[PDB]
Design a protein around this ligand. Sequence first.
Ligand code: HEM
Ligand SMILES: Cc1ccccc1O
Length: 137
Amino acid sequence: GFKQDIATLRGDLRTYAQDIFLAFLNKYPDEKRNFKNYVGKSDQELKSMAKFGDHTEKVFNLMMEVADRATDCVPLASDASTLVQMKQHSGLTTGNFEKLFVALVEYMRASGQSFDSQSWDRFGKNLVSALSSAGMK
Ligand code: HEM
Ligand SMILES: Cc1ccccc1O
């Protein structure tokens, strides 16, 4: 289920973080408005760029912590607050997060692995709800 999936992702996190983030940027190319230095680069070129690997892994490090601290795929209000208040998220609206979780769920469905994709879907929905409650537009 969801908790096992956190363990699975954490066992190969730099690879999963990069591959899921690439799935997001390729599904929603307009999202590079937020990631100007990733423009004009193939997947293999991005997987060579230091901030790409470093930043995406740190994003997924925190995402797995938020998922692990959740109960029944509902994140802590403290975690939602942190994600809204972060200066690096100043630009953002809940639709940016919705898209990331659409890509993550479609990645998991496309995988051979017994990921609990319905739980990740609910998690993404519940995190968007919590971000809206915590003041994200
Ligand atoms: C649960 C989802 C997310 C988590 C846990 C998260 C977490 C983080 C973390 C930890 C950083 C700092 C990275 C670093 O400086 O090394 C960061 C930076 C950033 N995040 Fe998020 N983030 C999430 C979703 C998003 C989404 C959906 C967007 C935009 C579509 C976004 C845009 C950014 C940007 C622009 C930065 C700073 C610039 C950059 O690192 O490229 N984040 N995020
Ligand atoms: C902030 C961020 C998130 C996911 C992948 C790369 C990246 O720079």
